[PDB]
Write a structure and sequence with these properties.
By secondary structure, this protein is mostly helical. Helix content is about 60%, strand content about 0%. This is C3a anaphylatoxin.
């Protein structure tokens, strides 16, 4: 979303330069409505990369939900 793209960049920045792809992919849209843990199960690609993915996924999932709630309540930022 609007300010969501922002908090994503800030989050991706927080990580060592070679774990940013993992973070980025952890925060892509979720049309199949899979849990964060479920989406890691077949990426392989590493242990330290799964921790990153999972952490960024959980981070952005919470932010999307908070955003959906604000939007539903007409507080929409």
């Amino acid at each position: 979303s609007v300010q969501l793209t922002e908090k994503r960049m800030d989050k991706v920045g927080k990580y060592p330069k070679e774990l940013r792809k993992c973070c980025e992919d952890g925060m892509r849209e979720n049309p199949m409505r899979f849990s964060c843990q479920r989406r890691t199960r077949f990426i392989s690609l590493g242990e330290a990369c799964k921790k990153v993915f999972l952490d960024c996924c959980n981070y952005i999932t919470e932010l999307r939900r908070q955003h959906a709630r604000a939007s539903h309540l007409g507080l929409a930022r």
